[PDB]
Amino acid sequence: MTSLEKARELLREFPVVDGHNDLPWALREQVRYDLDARDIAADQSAHLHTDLARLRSGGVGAQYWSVYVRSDLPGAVTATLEQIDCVRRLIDRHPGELRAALTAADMEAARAEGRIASLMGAEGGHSIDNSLATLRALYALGVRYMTLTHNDNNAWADSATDEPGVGGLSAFGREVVREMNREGMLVDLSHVAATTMRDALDTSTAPVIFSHSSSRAVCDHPRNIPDDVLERLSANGGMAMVTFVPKFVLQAAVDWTAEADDNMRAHGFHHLDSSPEAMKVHAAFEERVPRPVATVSTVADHLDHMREVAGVDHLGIGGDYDGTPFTPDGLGDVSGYPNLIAELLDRGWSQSDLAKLTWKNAVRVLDAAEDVSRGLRAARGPSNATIEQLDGT
Numbered sequence: 001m002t003s004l005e006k007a008r009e010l011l012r013e014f015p016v017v018d019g020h021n022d023l024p025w026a027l028r029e030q031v032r033y034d035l036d037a038r039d040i041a042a043d044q045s046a047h048l049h050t051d052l053a054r055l056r057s058g059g060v061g062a063q064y065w066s067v068y069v070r071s072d073l074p075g076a077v078t079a080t081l082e083q084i085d086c087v088r089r090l091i092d093r094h095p096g097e098l099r100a101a102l103t104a105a106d107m108e109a110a111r112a113e114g115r116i117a118s119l120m121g122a123e124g125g126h127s128i129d130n131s132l133a134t135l136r137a138l139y140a141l142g143v144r145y146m147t148l149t150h151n152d153n154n155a156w157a158d159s160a161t162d163e164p165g166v167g168g169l170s171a172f173g174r175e176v177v178r179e180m181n182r183e184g185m186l187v188d189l190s191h192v193a194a195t196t197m198r199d200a201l202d203t204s205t206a207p208v209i210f211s212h213s214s215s216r217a218v219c220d221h222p223r224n225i226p227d228d229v230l231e232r233l234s235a236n237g238g239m240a241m242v243t244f245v246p247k248f249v250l251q252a253a254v255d256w257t258a259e260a261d262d263n264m265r266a267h268g269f270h271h272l273d274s275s276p277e278a279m280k281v282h283a284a285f286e287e288r289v290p291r292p293v294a295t296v297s298t299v300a301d302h303l304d305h306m307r308e309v310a311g312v313d314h315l316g317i318g319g320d321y322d323g324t325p326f327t328p329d330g331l332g333d334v335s336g337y338p339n340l341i342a343e344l345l346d347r348g349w350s351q352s353d354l355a356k357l358t359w360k361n362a363v364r365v366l367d368a369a370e371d372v373s374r375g376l377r378a379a380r381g382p383s384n385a386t387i388e389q390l391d392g393t
Ligand SMILES: N[C@@H](Cc1ccc(O)cc1)P(=O)(O)C[C@H](CC(=O)O)C(=O)O
Pocket: 022, 025, 029, 068, 123, 212, 223, 245, 320, 323, 324, 325
């Protein structure tokens, strides 16, 4: 059979655990959670990267659904609860296809019955409003990882896409990591500064993840992971879930985006300005310089290097579907994963290597978080500390 046919066979046995899909935010923005208007039991290819049929075609067996909210707007906690509610509603609406999962055992139970294990990950520490009790409430509601920042610093952690702030984690930031370890919530180091990555690895007594980050050695961008950090994953026991975002994984797209951003500033606009006037400027840039397009090969280049440095036991996949506008050719929506698996087969990845990448590493890591949590919950009570106490007024 072809490598694509073999890939589909392999995914039927050990499907993809995807680290980060922003369907909930997409539903919030497109239809304010009017789920009938974007029914994922129907074909949503006109509007979304994600629906149930395409997930099945793609060999997705578990999904961390992102409960991302904007850090630059007030009411992040309320919005996070709305995002969690959206995930709960999706699970309730589609019991034939989805099964809530809170544990590694739930993931295996879902796989045994042919349902997609549906987990939640918060995207940015702003979702806890500097409150450890709020962190504990998010865990109680089912959140199983939290990205420590999004694109901006928060009071206790530095983002890769902001200026230096506290220098990594503050004292309260370390306290957040400790409490995540005690609860069993995975520490997610996507988005954070390299300083923050190192501080989190120093502090964490559980395996950490990167829910959607690729390799900085392959493509120098702050959203990607440095080799020295990848090297620490074996010891930590965690995993880096490669992402598909072209402006992170393809050198030409990194360079193009930098030039587009410079061009915006040359016209007196902030690079994130989305006014009609700013859009005119950007359209003119794209007219003279077309947007480069990544491929499955681009993503495989990241995985090859990540495998060399981190090891095959420390890799996963986090596509970022419905969280980013552009995709590599062959990975245009959630049905695309078999194309990546086929490319890896062609590059000599073994069947067991691939079962680790798709399924086994993610289950091991969540189980490890549970194991560390058992020990810490038995050893001490929850923290009552405040940011004022640990970081000063
Ligand atoms: N949650 C998404 C951001 C978002 C998307 C849409 C929206 O209205 C607001 C925020 P993201 O962080 O998952 C995607 C980002 C790359 C990109 O911007 O393309 C990255 O991961 O680094």
